[PDB]
Structure formats: C-alpha cells, structure tokens
Amino acid sequence: NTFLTKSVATPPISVIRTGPKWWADPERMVRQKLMYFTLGVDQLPLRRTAVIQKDLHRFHMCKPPPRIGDTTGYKRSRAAQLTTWYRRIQYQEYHLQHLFTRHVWGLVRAYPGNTTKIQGKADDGYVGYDSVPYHRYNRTPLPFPAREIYGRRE
Amino acid sequence: ISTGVFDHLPFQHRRQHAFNTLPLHDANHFGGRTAYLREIGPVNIKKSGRRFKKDLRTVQFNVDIWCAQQTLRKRWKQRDWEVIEVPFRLAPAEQQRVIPEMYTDVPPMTDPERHDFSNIRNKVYDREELQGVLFGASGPLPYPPLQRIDRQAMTLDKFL
Amino acid sequence: GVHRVGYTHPSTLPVPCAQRWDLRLARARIFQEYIEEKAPGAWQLEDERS
Amino acid sequence: NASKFPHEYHTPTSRFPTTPKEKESESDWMAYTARYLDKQFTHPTEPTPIYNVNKLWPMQQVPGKIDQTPFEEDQTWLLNPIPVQQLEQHHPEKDLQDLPFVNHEQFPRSLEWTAP
Amino acid sequence: WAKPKKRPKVGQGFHEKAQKWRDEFLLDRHRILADSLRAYVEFSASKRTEPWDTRFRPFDRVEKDGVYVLMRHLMEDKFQLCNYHHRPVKRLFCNVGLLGPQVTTKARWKPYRYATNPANTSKAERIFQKDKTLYTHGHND
Amino acid sequence: TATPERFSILGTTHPKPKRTGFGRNNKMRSKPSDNVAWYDKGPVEWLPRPVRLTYDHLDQLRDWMMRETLDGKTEEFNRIRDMHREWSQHPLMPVLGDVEPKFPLNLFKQNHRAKRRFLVRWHKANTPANWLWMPRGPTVVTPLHHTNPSQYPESWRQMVR
Amino acid sequence: QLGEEYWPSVEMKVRKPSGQSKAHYSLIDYDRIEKKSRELYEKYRDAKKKSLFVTPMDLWLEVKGM
Amino acid sequence: SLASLYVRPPVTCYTDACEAPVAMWNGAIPLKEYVTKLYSHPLEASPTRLSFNDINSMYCVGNDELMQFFPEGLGGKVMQLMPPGHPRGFLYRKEAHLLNLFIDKIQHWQAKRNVLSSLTNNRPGFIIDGPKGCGKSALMCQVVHYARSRNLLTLYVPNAKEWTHGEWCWPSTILPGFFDAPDAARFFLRYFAKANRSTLLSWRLKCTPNDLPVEQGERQPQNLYELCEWGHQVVAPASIDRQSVCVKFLMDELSAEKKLPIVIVVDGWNLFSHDTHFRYPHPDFLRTLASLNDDSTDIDLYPQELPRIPASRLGFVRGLNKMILSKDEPNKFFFTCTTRDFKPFDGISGFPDVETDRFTNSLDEYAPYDAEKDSLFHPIQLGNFDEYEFRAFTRFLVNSGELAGLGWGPLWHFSSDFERKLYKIGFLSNRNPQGVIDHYHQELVWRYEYQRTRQKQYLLHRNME
Amino acid sequence: SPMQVQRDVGRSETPLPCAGNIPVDRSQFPFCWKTEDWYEYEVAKVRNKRFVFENTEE
RNA sequence: UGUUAAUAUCAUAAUCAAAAUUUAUUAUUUAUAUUAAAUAUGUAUGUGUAGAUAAAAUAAGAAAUUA
Ligand SMILES: Nc1nc2c(ncn2[C@@H]2O[C@H](COP(=O)(O)OP(=O)(O)OP(=O)(O)O)[C@@H](O)[C@H]2O)c(=O)[nH]1
C-alpha cells in the first residue's frame, strides 16, 4: 500500500454520483469483488449496486419518461423514493467495501493511509509520516518514525 | 500496448487526494520519479517554488526521458544473447548473405525457400551449437553438446 | 555489466575479419564524423514519442 | 584534486551516466567467484570466444575504455546521479525556430516535401 | 490607456542610502553564507538515520533476520562510513547485488525530508523546526 | 570580513508580519473542518478517507488465505463471515416520504461552498450509528446467511447424525 | 578485394549459456567444494559454541580487516 | 418454488458440507421432483478410483485431504477458486490422467524400470510446457496429491520464483563458492518435514554428520525428519546456517537413498534454468573500506550491475541438478513445470499504473525460454482448454459458486444463462484457462446483456395472454 | 459457414458466396506479429522514404 | 477594448542583452528518491480550516416547481 499521505473526505452521495466513472468503475467493482471471492463472502451488495449501475449506464444516453401536469403530483415523490432506495442500497455497499478493505489490511498486515481507521488493530486512525507533527484529527504529537501497527514477523 | 501512464498530467489546479484524484506529483507516478519534479507545501508563488516545476513542457520532457529509461530497461533485460563478431567464413549459413543494415530494408527474412520467414535480425544462436566456430580449438568444450527432445519417441506425450 | 570495451586485432583470431570498431574508424574518417569518447554505454536512449 | 570532488568539475564535454572507477576483475560470475569468493576455483573466467563480443550493442565504443551497458534493473536510474532537463530545451536544428509556437520557416514548402 | 505617469524623482541622497544599505546587506550575507556552509557540511558529514521505512517488506522483517542480517553482515561498515545519507545508502544497496531490484520496488524509503534527520531522532518536530536562517535548501540539521 | 558588531540600516528595516492564518489568503484559521474523521462510530470512520485496494494486496490476501486455510484455522474466517452478516442484510425499502434533503435553494449563490458544506456536514452526522434504514442487531433474522459458525463447512463434523 | 582480413565480420546473436549447460554450474568442482564443506562443517560445529550465529564470514567469506 | 418443502441432504464430505442457503442458490439450481436440486457439488473422489471415466470432469479435494497433502501450500495461483466456502475442485484433464498413470507406475518403479524409461525417453521426468494461461501449477498440485495418495516421498517445489527471487540471498555456510536460499529453504525444510513425517520417521541417515551442532537439551537428529526438525525448530539467525546444512545433507541423503521411490515436482524450472534476480555482491563489499574521500570507491557514489547469479549457484538447485545430471538414481522422478509469471513488454513500456497492475507480483524478467534447449526434462504440452474442458470447468464454476452462493444467487435473473454466459466467457478468454477463471469473475460488469430483459419482456408480454 | 447460412427471409440466397471455401492460415490471417517486426518495419518504412532511385530501367 | 486617415506649437525619452513589483481583471508543482549547461525564485508544516466569492449540462455518463 503506497499512498500514505493525507486524503480528502467525500460523502457517499458524491462518491456514488461519479457514476460509471469511478463509482461504477467497472475495473474497481471487479477488484473489490475479488476481495470478497478471496475471503469467501457472498457479494450480494456489490452485485446489487452493479445491477443498478449497469441499468443506469444503459439508460443514461436516454431521456426521462414524460411527466403529467398533475396538481396532485404523485410521480414526484414516488420517483423520489425510488432514487433514494437506490441511494440507500449504495450507502450500505459503500460501507461494506470500506469495512472489508480496512479489515483485510489488518489481515495482510498492510498499513492503511493516514488516519484511516482500522478497527482490526487500532481504535484510532493510522497516523505516520504526516505533513504535520500533530495528529490530524486528535491533535496528538506523532512518533518518529511512523507508528508501528502489526507484528514484526513477515 | 502498455497500460502504463506515459504522459505527465496537464499542469492545472491542484489535484487533491480523494477517489480518482492523487497528488499531481505523488510517490506513485513514474515509480516515485515525480520526486524530481515535486515541491512541498502551498508554495508562495512569487518568491518560492522552482520555475521549472511549474511549466508543462520541461516537466513533460523529464517524464519522456524517464519513459525512455523504462523502455531501455525492459529491452536490454530481454537479452539472453550477446553479439559475437564471427568472421564471414564460420558463421552458420543463414548469416552469410547481404543482410541490409537496421532500418535499411524490410526486416529481412531468414529464408523463404526453406519455410522460415523468421526475423534474422531476431534469430538467436546458442553457444553449444556455435562451439565448432568460436572456441573450436580450445580443448574440452566448456559447455556440453545439447541434449535434444525426441518427438517421435513413444512417451507419455503420445498417450502411452 | 561493467564490461571493458575490448577489440582484438584481425590478426589474433584464427580467421581474420574486419572488426566493427575499425569500420567505425574508417567511416568517421570518410564522412568527417567526430567520435565522442565520453559517450557512456548506459545511455543508448531512443525518443519513443518520436 | 579534480577527481576528489565528482560533481563540481564538469567539462562542456563531460557526460552521464558518469562511469565508476573499476575494481580488479568484476567481469562475470566465473571470474567473480575465482578471485572474490572461491580463490581456488578451477575456471579462470567464463570460457570466452577468441572473437569480438560487441556487448555494447549496437553502440560502437572506444576500446580500452571501461564502459557500462544499458542497465537492466529499473532501480539504478532512480538511484543514479542523473539530472532532469531544467533550463531551456535545445536541438541544434530546431533551435533556429526558437519555440514550437513561433516555428519559423524560410520558404512555404510542404511539410511532406520529398527533396530530390 | 491613460498616459503612464512618470516615476517621480528618486529623492535626495537615496542613491547613497541604497549604497550603504546594500553594502551592509552583502556584509550580512558574509556571515550568513559562512554559517550556512558550516551547517550544510555538518549536515553532509553527519551520519544520518534510516532512509527506508519499516512499514513495508523487506524492511518490515525483524531487526534480526533476512535483509537485516545481510545489512549487518555485508554493509554495516559502509553505511556508518557514508553517513547513512539516503542517496549513498540506496546506492550501496544497489551494489549489494543480493537483493536484486528491490531497493526501489519493494523497499519503502522515507520521504526526502523524513530521511535527512541525524541518527536516532524520536520527534516529529525536528523537520518542522530545523533552522530557517541557514539557506541550505533545507540541507542542514 | 570582520563582521561589524553594529548594523547600520539593513537590520533596522520594517518587520514583514508573518502570515497569521493558513490556507487561502493565509487567513484560514486553526479550527476543526468538514474533513475531520471519527474513530468512535463504526469500523470505518465517517467520513472515511478514500482507500484504494491494489492487485498487490489481492495477491497478498490470497496467499494469507492459503496459509490460514491450510493451518486448520477458521476463526478469522468466521470473524470475516460474521462481520459480513452484520452489514450485508437487505435494508428495508424507505418509507414513502423519506428522502435525502438537498440543500435548500435561494440562500447562497449557486456556486457557493456552503451548499456542499452542509451536504458533507450532514453526510458526516449520518454515521453507521445513524443508519436506521438497514436491519442490524439481535432483532434481525437472516434467512439468507448461516446462523451459527457451526454451519460453516470447515466444522463439517457437526451436522452428521 | 584485397583479402579476407578485410571481409567484414558478421554480427551473431550468440545466446548466453542455456540451462542444459547452466545445470553443470552447481557440480563444477563438486569434489573440492564438498571437501571444504566437510572441513568447514567441523569448524562450524566448533563455532556454534562461540557465537549465536555462524555466518560464512567466519567460514569461507574473507575480507581485509583494513 | 419448493423452498420450504426442500430438505437438506446429509453431510459426509466437504462438498456435502458447502451447500448454500436454498434461498440463495434457489433459482440458480432448480429444484425438481421429495423435491431435489438439479445441480450438485461434485464428489470427493480418490485417485485410486479415478480412471479413464473421470476425464474432462470435475472431482475435488476436501479441506482434510488437502491439508493432508499440501502443507507447504499450493503453487502459483492455486487458491484462487478456493475461498472457504468453495469446494476445491480439480479437473481430470487428458494429460493429468497420463501423469496419474505415470505415478501409478511409480510406487512400483522397480518392476517398471524399463516401463518408465519407455515412458520418459530416458529424460528425467517431465516439464510441463505451455504458455501463460494454462493449468501448470494446478496440474503439478494434482500430481502431488496423486503421489502422496500413493505414499511417495514428494519434494514439491511450489514456485521457482521463491527460490530464485526471494527477499534476499546469501552465501551458503558450508558450501564455499556457492549460495543457498535462506528463507525459501527455511520454509522448504519446515514443510517437507511436516509433510512426509510418515516416511521420514522411519527414514534413517546414510551420509550425514552424526556430530551435528545441536542446542543444549535438543535431541540429536537421527531420522531424516529429526534432521529437519532440528533444522527449522531453532532460534534465528542460527536458522540460516542450520538450513544450508540441512539442504546440503538432506540432498546427500536423497541422492544416496536408492530404494524408496521419490517424486520431485518443481513449479517453474524455467526460473531454475537461468539466473536469479540476485547478483553477486560488490568486491568493495568484501574488503572493509577504510575511508571515503580517497579510496577509489564508487559504490557509495554510483550503482552498477555486477554479473547475475545463475540458479545453479544455490545449494538447493545444487542438489537438484545433482539429482538430475547425476544418473544411477532411477528412483527419482522430476515432474517440473514452466511458469510465465513475468510482466509484459510489447515494444514500449511506460510506468505501469500502481493501482491498476495485474502483474505487480510478476517477476521483472521478460526473458525468453525454450522447453527443449533449456531443460533435461521431457516436455508435456498442456495447451489451452478445448471448449470441452472449458465447458466442464466453467459449469463447475458458474453453478457451484451458486450452490455455495459465492456468485449471483437471488440476483440470478440478471446475468445470462449458461449457454450465453459461457459464450461470453469463452469469447473474452479465447478458451484460455486464465481468461476463463477471470472472466467468470469480471462477469459482474458485463454491461451489454439482453437475455434477461428480452425474457422479462416475454413474461410481461405473455403473462397478459 | 456464415457466408453460406441463408440469413435472408424471402428470396433464396443462391448463388452462395464463392468464399464459402477459403482456408484458414494463422500464418496469413488473423494478423498476428511480434513487436520488433512492427517497429523495424515501420521505422524502416519511414527512413527509406527518400531512397528512391526514380530512374530505374523498367 | 491602447497603438490606425485632416485641431498643432513645452521639452529627442524606444529593446543590440543581464534590467527597480502596487499592478483588480490570476488556476502552484502537496512527503520513496529535490540544482549538468545562455542563470532560472529561500519560503507560507499546521483540524482542506473567516466573509464573500470562480467555473461548468459541448466525449463523456447529471434529471424535474415555464416566463
Ligand atoms: N480448486 C482448483 N483450482 C484450479 C485447478 N486448476 C486451475 N485452478 C485454479 O486456477 C489457478 C490458476 O491455475 P495454475 O496453472 O495452477 O496457476 P499458475 O499460472 O501456475 O500461477 P502463477 O505461476 O503465479 O502465475 C489455479 O492455480 C487454481 O487457482 C484445479 O484443478 N482445482
């Protein structure tokens, strides 16, 4: 794991909105599915999201379905509940992927990026070789060299 | 065919570190070579900062030399042969004609009339067959003759 | 590898043959080619983009 | 004391990669074990064709000059003392035109001109 | 386009006040250069601390075995000689030959500025408080 | 040389006051930001930092898997499978009228930063501790995964009659 | 047209020694290497009472002290 | 659809154990009439029963038979289809059957000496040749399971990349002029002993030092298993010298014993037939420099490329070529292989994208190879799958990943049927074995499939009428 | 062969394509080649642009 | 929107090197590896952090409150 400097915190909604660019990054959906097929877990969530985004990509170059001029307006919050179920599906999936990687990194004994919490080894985030001698979120002075996380037998 | 990133990225506003975004000159671009074009901190534009790590064409030239370094690494790694200057009399027959130089004629065929249009610029000869040529008169052959694999021989490969 | 550029006369071999550095010398004589001698061997880069 | 300080004194001819000063018999693995590991090894060096090995291929190089070959491991270029092209970028012919954007031309000749 | 106003006169004697100002400025540069070369060459000849990172293999192996035993049993004198500086350290590693290419591909080395602190430092404030008057391009302790 | 022990005019010059704050205009203070992560809520901090898994890590994991699988070990396996059965049950259809609130318009300019600032500062507070839209707990039945670490096939000497 | 001493040589891509001839590179001087094995082994069995680890530096690896 | 009135059949093998929740594999494996499934986990068959009528079909190994017969692990990528829930399923290819018959002659090689010489063409064992994209290391693992189900002493080298490309190399302690493989061989002793504890407990030493330096209270090695136990059950860094001692004298034992049949199976002898990624350490590392300014030293200043160590310069390969090249050991059989796990090179190469690199753990080798000119072994050509073995292997994948739920499950109405999923897999692989194993995985992102929407239109068009 | 299967609906595709009997040469098509072939070919093509003896004796 | 074709009647201000920031109308390179060619920027580590502000529906992938 090379990238160990600081990272930018983006919410799931915008991490998903990047659509088929990185959210439905097919080669990233695949490479996280490989973590699941290694660990021996069912890929129910990532496969659900892949189905949804395959639909969305197939029906991105197309126009929405026509609205009717209803003062009573039902289509609106119905398509709203539809979208926000898709969104909640993807929020769950986002969390599953993050959890599996931050656990598999404690299993491979590999260090995560800076202040990337891994509850497999340390209840707080991994701070080490940082652009600041203070904790980026706790404001705790860093040890030199980077703090050590796993055992020493490799 | 190469899924590497050959081009230095356009000098634009600051690519942050999130999903789909690294530092424009982090440790992973060109195997850590962006260390030679990276500067640290929100540089004071007027007074600090090296004027040649802000331009696009010079940083791209550096990156091009580094890509060429890579091509040279893999190319010279790809050699299990060396170029041994054999006189004309002793070289095996496929190297006894007018072989035009590099980039001179079409990359010439070994021999058409013998069912081998194999690159004679890319034909490799083994010491243990050119032994009679080079160090023929040097006593005991420093390598043994080659042990061959018999394909008419009735072994497990012929379903017995 | 750190190899000494060696060149054996057309007289030492038990078959004489015109050797390639001598041919280089004949060519830098005919077409007045400067032979830069500080030319290191590890820098045979070609311009891939070109 | 010119060689005591490697990077101060660079002739307008001096060129890189700056070759290191040679040890005794670093040539191959047979000679390496013969002099360096097993001083009593049977074979003097890898039995050599009496002919010419143009190791440095195809670069014809000055004999009697201790040279390197183009490296193999992608580490040594990262870990050499090779600089990056900092100042302007010249080519002895292109330098007439002074830049890409202001590319000069004497006559309006075609770019695919097949000179006789 | 309004007609650019002429710069007013420089003033009285200021040509010589700038004379004396720059005079004692290069005067001050005398000592600044002296002290800065002092600090840079002590930085140079000082045995530095580890350039690698102990967060990756093969430098995550125990400080007793593997590449560490090779480091103690072939290069333990050379590193102390050449002052642990990351550049000569990595080149002695390139010439140790029994690690292959790994001294780049698998080895993780500290950043340029985490690498140039002297031997055995334990603070993170060292790099961020090194003296800012020694114009060493950060090549001082 | 002989550096004068008194300085005439150069050292007397007005002190350029150091930049007070950090960041844009060197004015952005030292106080918490939208970007701060939380270590008290979930195994994945919220908001998380972007991680990136590589094929190096996929292979290291595959090799770790061969070892922990051929060492008879299945405990970290069943831990994996339980931390999977925690978060991978289908979350309920949202109640009709439940929607992520967009930032209300007609306060800031269209290109403002407070619009995305409120979005991030609400998506932070909506932690996994606040995920009430998915089934989690001892109140959930799982008709799709296996109930006890005894139904896993590595302990297959248990279901035999 | 003056003689073979001017006939220009050929460039042959003479392959490096293959595996069939690289396999003999472990048995070259097998007799002497195994003998110095049998002797160094006795010095090593001795040394294992002197230090925690017996490197080949004290067996067949040699350096000038200064 | 017969989910409640489906009952689970009993547990007798691991493949009987990995049945997924009926809801997960429900529509995947149709339950038809007591109602039972159409597709089933394949039977854990023993090789002593495996014969001409298991060819092109999938048998497997249970966790027990595997942990019994593969303690060092498997070869290159061989745990890729073996997540915990997956039954580790091997195909009975038409050349793997030839190898099983060869081993069937092995455990009586003495009576079948001329038999195997007719079968080996006097060439010591077989090297498995074929491109990147075949079943080489898995084939060798099948061979290893074969032999160890025949009670044969099997030296199974799981990867020659570990032996010639470790994290370090070293001078062999009792092998002047040579080297040994410290950590790869550290694992070799530990797992060869903990593998063949059966033969090596009754094994007795023939040409070994009975004056071994043993830590106080630790029992002197008298078996061949005691040798290795003393050899890897020790404190470091003493383990490195103990392991080179163990490699040399274990090879002397294995080249001295003439009676018990011995199987030796090496994954990737093309990475043994040439130079190791280690090179020779600098001579200025052999002389204890005195000072830096004036010594004529350019190791701290500049790197250089000292010549490369051929794999014949390690002690394990030392004894291995000592077994191959030295005849009069018609008891040992060298089933080695050819790995092609290097990075690609196709005219150019930029700087491979870190996050996107499926060959990072490939070896920066690029170098050629020739099965004939580079081996004493006889080449066994394991070409690519026919659509035959492709289809059988893939049915196993695509339906047992269901029956353990590792795949599509209750989302099965989205990815196509078998006869089109297989068409897609076999296109995207060109029947290549690896392309198949990875385009059964990249199946997630197949973004141009209409079988299910055309069938949904047929249902929401006819289920009106 | 696909050139032989009557994909047509109403009128009979007779005669069939005369290609309905072409051989298969992996040495001719598909176009497979190695990279030094590609490179030397193209750069030689490029450099030999000028070497035209426009006055042959044809 | 500076240099351009009819009003006269204060004064020579015009690059051939090395150059003096007050001028709103500007996208800086972010921690594995940091000075070799006309010389080429030594300052601003800090919870991505006040206020107000920039851009864009165009090969990328956006979806619903008309005057
Ligand atoms: N369970 C099982 N998996 C197999 C089998 N055959 C192939 N595979 C799977 O697919 C992997 C790839 O096949 P191999 O030929 O063995 O892999 P490899 O190319 O030698 O590995 P590398 O040298 O690292 O490239 C296998 O190693 C297994 O993971 C088999 O018979 N049973």
Ligand SMILES: [Mg+2]
């Ligand atoms: Mg393999």
